Amino acid sequence: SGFRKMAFPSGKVEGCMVQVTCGTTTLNGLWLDDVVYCPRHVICTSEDMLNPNYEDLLIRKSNHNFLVQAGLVQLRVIGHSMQNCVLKLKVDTANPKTPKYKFVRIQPGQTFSVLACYNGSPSGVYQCAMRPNFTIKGSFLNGSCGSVGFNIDYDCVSFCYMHHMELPTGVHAGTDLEGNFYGPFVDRQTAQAAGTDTTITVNVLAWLYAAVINGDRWFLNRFTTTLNDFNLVAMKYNYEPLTQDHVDILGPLSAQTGIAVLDMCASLKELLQNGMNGRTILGSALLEDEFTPFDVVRQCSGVTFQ
Amino acid sequence: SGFRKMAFPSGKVEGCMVQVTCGTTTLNGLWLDDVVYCPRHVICTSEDMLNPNYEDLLIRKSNHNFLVQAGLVQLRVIGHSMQNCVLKLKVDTANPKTPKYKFVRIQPGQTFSVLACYNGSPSGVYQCAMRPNFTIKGSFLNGSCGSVGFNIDYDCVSFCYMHHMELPTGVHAGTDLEGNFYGPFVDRQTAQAAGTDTTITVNVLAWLYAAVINGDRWFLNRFTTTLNDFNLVAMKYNYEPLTQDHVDILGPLSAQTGIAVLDMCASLKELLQNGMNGRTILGSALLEDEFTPFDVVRQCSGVTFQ
Ligand SMILES: CC(C)(C)C(=O)[C@H](Oc1ccc(Cl)cc1)n1ccnc1
Ligand SMILES: CC(C)(C)C(=O)[C@H](Oc1ccc(Cl)cc1)n1ccnc1
């Protein structure tokens, strides 16, 4: 019993972290097979970041300008290229610790673990979600760029995020491993602001199921609702509209607990309209939205990984 | 910027997890050098757990009754002994992945990371604290016993917890790596209940400093207090008494922010008496107490680990 914000074990990703230095800038890279992936802004000065022309800046860089270090051992760079907002640095040695892996582009609402690193060295691991506004709420200091987010299924690491930017409001933006930003963000220091931080309704419902499984049931009520009635309340509270697809995804948790999805929606509706009245659910005083249905099933059943 | 509940990278501990089976019971063990540590209740049936005589049950077990498996490879058990509530299974092969390590017995209020495992395989990592009542609030299912808690300083893993028991109220009890339970708990299925779950005041204050560092400052007020006046309020709210030692430990965070410790105490006092008024601090609607002062400094400065 018990339900915690849980990250994937980080060891398979730790073995892939390197330090990348270009001129005066040091950040992290991800070493998989014979390629190191890192943010293209490694080539910028702080001055450059206001209005960088990456293609032009890159002309002045050769393979030997990209210093790649794995622990205390230097890697030899034999080629480099820009793909969208990442650089791919070809090295002469395949990472002997390369796990089975895939590159995935996730949808808003999906969760993942972040291995925060500095100077190629892991500092901590924590769980995030891709927000509906395409930011993430991370913990990233200067030097953390190039840290990655990932999910694991058994023995395969699916990398879904590389960290690039902090907005002036303290939230975070980044790319998939093909170098395409999530949402509308760019690797320039400009006036870009995040849109509404909508609550991920299907995840809140999953977490309410987790609460019931783990003994917290005070919020269950005598009511039901419909998708359309619930969504009229979801809209008022800046919740994502709940779809039939979301209902179907909650099916297994509905079956395990015997609580119909629309009944749980009615419990959530009452929580939104009435608040918590100073009570808690799974040690939280707000409605948690960074557990997916699959996260809840995984943690409540004990799924492990090679 | 940003502040997250962050666990240590788990790779060094992943390399130490094995599966231990004795008769019909399977749980996790920790393999360091040529010794595997695991809970002594591996030798019990579910029936035995009501009133086990461990010394007597152990008589019926030989080295070959302890099946130890590291991934898909079996380890040879050449000796075994009971030390308090753990078994030490001597194996004929030193773990080649043994990190630098220490065994530490932590104080209530100190935090640590847990690598939850099943069948010797890591499932997730999360952050915990030793509560003032000597429980921890974890996420542990059947088969998770033998999962460990730990801290890392650079390249050395300090193991501080091994999981043994779930109380009927859903909180968790366990031992240090010498096999001594934290608090008054025992490895028997009996009526043992946890005492008051007191809030770790020094950790709440550390987290309020983290909030200020990261931009959340609405709760700063015009007031100050004294230790004795604050503690009269701490007592009413089931907070641990704040000592001069705690004040001294907060010194660095006080210096970084320029907010005197007793001023932050006065802010906390107002939060306790008035509540949050529906506001949040670092994405929380309650006062978080599972970050230590050292955790806050570490995460706010970017300390990494070999
Ligand atoms: C943007 C998205 C995810 C909808 C997309 O178009 C996706 O392409 C990828 C992009 C980045 C990676 Cl890392 C992986 C796939 N896709 C291709 C074919 N069907 C879907
Ligand atoms: C119980 C405690 C922590 C106060 C204690 O007595 C401690 O002993 C240990 C016990 C378990 C481990 Cl894992 C490590 C040390 N100690 C010895 C000498 N001074 C302090």
Short mmCIF file of N, CA and C in Angstrom, two decimals, chain A residues 1-12 14 115 118 121-128 137-141 166 170 172 280 283-286 290 299-305, chain B residues 1-12 14 115 118 121-128 137-141 166 170 172 280 283-286 290 299-305:
data_model
loop_
_atom_site.label_atom_id
_atom_site.label_comp_id
_atom_site.label_asym_id
_atom_site.label_seq_id
_atom_site.Cartn_x
_atom_site.Cartn_y
_atom_site.Cartn_z
N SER A 1 0.80 -1.20 0.00
CA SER A 1 0.00 0.00 0.00
C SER A 1 0.85 1.27 0.00
N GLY A 2 0.19 2.41 -0.11
CA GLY A 2 0.91 3.65 -0.31
C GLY A 2 1.06 3.98 -1.78
N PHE A 3 1.07 5.27 -2.06
CA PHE A 3 1.14 5.75 -3.44
C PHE A 3 2.02 6.99 -3.45
N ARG A 4 3.13 6.93 -4.19
CA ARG A 4 4.13 7.98 -4.22
C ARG A 4 4.39 8.46 -5.64
N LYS A 5 4.78 9.73 -5.77
CA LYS A 5 5.30 10.21 -7.04
C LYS A 5 6.62 9.50 -7.30
N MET A 6 6.62 8.58 -8.26
CA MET A 6 7.70 7.63 -8.44
C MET A 6 8.30 7.81 -9.83
N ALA A 7 9.62 7.92 -9.90
CA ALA A 7 10.34 7.95 -11.16
C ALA A 7 10.83 6.56 -11.52
N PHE A 8 11.15 6.37 -12.80
CA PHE A 8 11.78 5.13 -13.21
C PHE A 8 13.19 5.05 -12.65
N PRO A 9 13.70 3.84 -12.40
CA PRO A 9 15.11 3.71 -12.01
C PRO A 9 15.97 4.34 -13.10
N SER A 10 16.99 5.08 -12.68
CA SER A 10 17.71 5.94 -13.60
C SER A 10 19.01 5.34 -14.12
N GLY A 11 19.38 4.13 -13.71
CA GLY A 11 20.72 3.64 -14.01
C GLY A 11 21.00 3.54 -15.50
N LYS A 12 20.02 3.06 -16.28
CA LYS A 12 20.23 2.90 -17.71
C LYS A 12 20.50 4.25 -18.38
N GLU A 14 21.79 6.97 -16.62
CA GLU A 14 23.04 7.48 -16.05
C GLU A 14 24.23 7.09 -16.92
N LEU A 115 16.23 12.86 -15.45
CA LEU A 115 17.51 12.73 -14.74
C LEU A 115 18.22 14.06 -14.86
N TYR A 118 24.40 17.86 -14.20
CA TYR A 118 25.28 19.02 -14.39
C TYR A 118 26.67 18.52 -14.71
N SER A 121 27.14 14.86 -15.00
CA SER A 121 27.02 14.02 -13.81
C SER A 121 25.61 14.08 -13.25
N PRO A 122 24.99 12.93 -12.99
CA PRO A 122 23.61 12.93 -12.50
C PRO A 122 23.48 13.53 -11.11
N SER A 123 22.45 14.34 -10.93
CA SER A 123 22.20 14.98 -9.65
C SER A 123 20.96 14.44 -8.96
N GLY A 124 19.91 14.14 -9.71
CA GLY A 124 18.67 13.68 -9.10
C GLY A 124 17.71 13.21 -10.17
N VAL A 125 16.70 12.49 -9.71
CA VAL A 125 15.67 12.00 -10.62
C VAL A 125 14.31 12.34 -10.04
N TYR A 126 13.39 12.74 -10.92
CA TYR A 126 12.05 13.12 -10.51
C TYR A 126 11.08 12.93 -11.66
N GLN A 127 9.81 12.99 -11.33
CA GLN A 127 8.75 12.70 -12.27
C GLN A 127 8.13 14.02 -12.73
N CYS A 128 7.83 14.11 -14.03
CA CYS A 128 7.24 15.28 -14.69
C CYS A 128 6.07 14.84 -15.56
N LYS A 137 7.06 21.41 -15.58
CA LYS A 137 7.43 22.06 -14.33
C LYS A 137 8.54 21.22 -13.72
N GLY A 138 9.79 21.58 -14.03
CA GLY A 138 10.94 20.82 -13.62
C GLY A 138 11.74 21.48 -12.52
N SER A 139 12.98 21.00 -12.34
CA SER A 139 13.93 21.62 -11.43
C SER A 139 15.25 21.64 -12.18
N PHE A 140 15.59 22.80 -12.73
CA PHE A 140 16.70 22.90 -13.66
C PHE A 140 17.45 24.19 -13.36
N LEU A 141 18.75 24.07 -13.11
CA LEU A 141 19.61 25.23 -12.91
C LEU A 141 20.50 25.40 -14.13
N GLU A 166 14.52 27.83 -19.88
CA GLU A 166 13.65 28.26 -18.79
C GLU A 166 12.98 29.56 -19.20
N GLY A 170 9.56 30.68 -14.82
CA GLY A 170 10.08 29.58 -14.04
C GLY A 170 9.66 28.20 -14.48
N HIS A 172 9.55 25.29 -17.84
CA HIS A 172 10.64 24.74 -18.64
C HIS A 172 10.15 24.29 -20.01
N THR A 280 -7.20 15.83 3.03
CA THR A 280 -6.16 15.44 2.08
C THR A 280 -6.55 14.15 1.39
N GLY A 283 -2.08 12.18 0.86
CA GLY A 283 -1.13 13.15 1.38
C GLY A 283 -1.05 14.47 0.64
N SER A 284 -2.02 14.76 -0.23
CA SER A 284 -2.05 16.00 -0.99
C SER A 284 -3.29 16.79 -0.62
N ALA A 285 -3.17 18.12 -0.67
CA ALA A 285 -4.29 19.01 -0.43
C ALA A 285 -4.80 19.65 -1.71
N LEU A 286 -4.26 19.25 -2.86
CA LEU A 286 -4.82 19.63 -4.14
C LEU A 286 -4.98 18.37 -4.99
N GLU A 290 -0.35 14.61 -12.29
CA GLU A 290 0.82 14.06 -12.97
C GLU A 290 1.03 12.56 -12.71
N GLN A 299 2.12 1.26 -10.70
CA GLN A 299 2.56 1.36 -9.32
C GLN A 299 1.70 0.51 -8.40
N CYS A 300 0.41 0.37 -8.71
CA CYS A 300 -0.47 -0.40 -7.85
C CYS A 300 -0.32 -1.91 -8.06
N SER A 301 0.33 -2.33 -9.16
CA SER A 301 0.53 -3.75 -9.42
C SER A 301 1.97 -4.22 -9.25
N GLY A 302 2.94 -3.31 -9.21
CA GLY A 302 4.33 -3.68 -8.97
C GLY A 302 5.14 -4.04 -10.19
N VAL A 303 4.85 -3.44 -11.35
CA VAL A 303 5.59 -3.77 -12.56
C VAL A 303 7.04 -3.36 -12.40
N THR A 304 7.95 -4.23 -12.83
CA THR A 304 9.38 -3.99 -12.72
C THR A 304 10.01 -3.92 -14.11
N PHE A 305 11.32 -3.66 -14.13
CA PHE A 305 12.04 -3.45 -15.38
C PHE A 305 13.37 -4.18 -15.35
N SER B 1 15.77 27.18 -12.06
CA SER B 1 14.67 27.37 -11.13
C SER B 1 13.73 26.17 -11.09
N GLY B 2 12.76 26.22 -10.18
CA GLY B 2 11.94 25.06 -9.93
C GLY B 2 12.49 24.21 -8.81
N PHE B 3 11.58 23.58 -8.09
CA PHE B 3 11.94 22.78 -6.93
C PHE B 3 11.03 21.56 -6.90
N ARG B 4 11.63 20.38 -6.98
CA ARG B 4 10.91 19.12 -7.09
C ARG B 4 11.32 18.14 -5.99
N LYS B 5 10.39 17.28 -5.60
CA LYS B 5 10.76 16.15 -4.76
C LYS B 5 11.66 15.22 -5.58
N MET B 6 12.94 15.20 -5.24
CA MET B 6 13.96 14.61 -6.09
C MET B 6 14.65 13.49 -5.32
N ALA B 7 14.76 12.32 -5.96
CA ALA B 7 15.52 11.21 -5.41
C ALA B 7 16.94 11.21 -5.97
N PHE B 8 17.83 10.51 -5.28
CA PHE B 8 19.17 10.31 -5.82
C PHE B 8 19.10 9.40 -7.04
N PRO B 9 20.03 9.55 -7.99
CA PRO B 9 20.11 8.59 -9.10
C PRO B 9 20.29 7.20 -8.52
N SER B 10 19.58 6.23 -9.09
CA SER B 10 19.46 4.93 -8.46
C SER B 10 20.41 3.88 -9.03
N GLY B 11 21.23 4.21 -10.02
CA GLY B 11 21.97 3.18 -10.73
C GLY B 11 22.91 2.39 -9.84
N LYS B 12 23.61 3.08 -8.92
CA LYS B 12 24.55 2.38 -8.05
C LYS B 12 23.84 1.37 -7.16
N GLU B 14 20.79 -0.07 -8.07
CA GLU B 14 20.21 -1.07 -8.96
C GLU B 14 21.16 -2.25 -9.13
N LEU B 115 14.56 2.68 -3.52
CA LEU B 115 14.45 1.97 -4.79
C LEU B 115 13.50 0.80 -4.55
N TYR B 118 10.78 -5.54 -6.90
CA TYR B 118 10.04 -6.79 -6.78
C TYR B 118 10.81 -7.88 -7.50
N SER B 121 14.05 -6.94 -9.02
CA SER B 121 14.08 -6.04 -10.16
C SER B 121 13.55 -4.67 -9.77
N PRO B 122 14.28 -3.60 -10.09
CA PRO B 122 13.83 -2.26 -9.69
C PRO B 122 12.56 -1.83 -10.41
N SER B 123 11.66 -1.23 -9.64
CA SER B 123 10.40 -0.75 -10.19
C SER B 123 10.31 0.76 -10.24
N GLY B 124 10.83 1.44 -9.23
CA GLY B 124 10.72 2.89 -9.18
C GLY B 124 11.57 3.44 -8.07
N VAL B 125 11.79 4.75 -8.13
CA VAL B 125 12.56 5.43 -7.10
C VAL B 125 11.79 6.65 -6.64
N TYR B 126 11.82 6.90 -5.33
CA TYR B 126 11.11 8.03 -4.75
C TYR B 126 11.77 8.43 -3.44
N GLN B 127 11.38 9.60 -2.97
CA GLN B 127 12.00 10.21 -1.81
C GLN B 127 11.08 10.02 -0.60
N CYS B 128 11.68 9.71 0.55
CA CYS B 128 11.00 9.47 1.82
C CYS B 128 11.69 10.26 2.93
N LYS B 137 6.40 6.86 5.04
CA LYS B 137 5.22 6.79 4.18
C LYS B 137 5.72 6.45 2.79
N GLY B 138 5.75 5.15 2.47
CA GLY B 138 6.31 4.66 1.24
C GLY B 138 5.26 4.18 0.25
N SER B 139 5.72 3.42 -0.74
CA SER B 139 4.83 2.76 -1.69
C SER B 139 5.39 1.35 -1.85
N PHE B 140 4.77 0.40 -1.17
CA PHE B 140 5.34 -0.93 -1.05
C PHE B 140 4.21 -1.94 -1.17
N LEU B 141 4.34 -2.87 -2.11
CA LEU B 141 3.38 -3.95 -2.26
C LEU B 141 4.01 -5.25 -1.78
N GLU B 166 4.40 -3.57 6.69
CA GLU B 166 3.34 -2.59 6.54
C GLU B 166 2.39 -2.71 7.72
N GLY B 170 -1.36 1.44 6.83
CA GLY B 170 -0.82 1.75 5.53
C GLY B 170 0.51 2.47 5.53
N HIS B 172 4.74 2.36 6.89
CA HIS B 172 5.77 1.35 6.66
C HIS B 172 6.83 1.39 7.75
N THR B 280 -0.99 28.32 -3.05
CA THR B 280 -0.03 27.23 -3.08
C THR B 280 1.38 27.78 -2.88
N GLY B 283 3.86 24.64 -5.73
CA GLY B 283 2.90 23.68 -6.24
C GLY B 283 2.22 22.81 -5.21
N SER B 284 2.33 23.14 -3.93
CA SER B 284 1.72 22.37 -2.86
C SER B 284 0.70 23.24 -2.13
N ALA B 285 -0.35 22.59 -1.63
CA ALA B 285 -1.36 23.27 -0.83
C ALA B 285 -1.25 22.93 0.64
N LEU B 286 -0.23 22.18 1.03
CA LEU B 286 0.09 21.97 2.43
C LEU B 286 1.58 22.25 2.64
N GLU B 290 9.27 16.98 3.94
CA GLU B 290 10.25 15.95 3.59
C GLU B 290 11.37 16.47 2.68
N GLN B 299 19.76 20.82 -3.93
CA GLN B 299 18.97 20.98 -5.15
C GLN B 299 19.07 22.39 -5.69
N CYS B 300 19.18 23.39 -4.82
CA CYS B 300 19.24 24.77 -5.27
C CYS B 300 20.62 25.14 -5.80
N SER B 301 21.66 24.34 -5.53
CA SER B 301 23.00 24.63 -6.02
C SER B 301 23.48 23.69 -7.12
N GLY B 302 22.83 22.54 -7.31
CA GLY B 302 23.18 21.64 -8.40
C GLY B 302 24.25 20.62 -8.09
N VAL B 303 24.35 20.16 -6.84
CA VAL B 303 25.38 19.19 -6.49
C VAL B 303 25.14 17.89 -7.23
N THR B 304 26.21 17.31 -7.77
CA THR B 304 26.13 16.07 -8.53
C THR B 304 26.92 14.97 -7.83
N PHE B 305 26.88 13.77 -8.42
CA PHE B 305 27.49 12.60 -7.82
C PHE B 305 28.23 11.80 -8.87
#
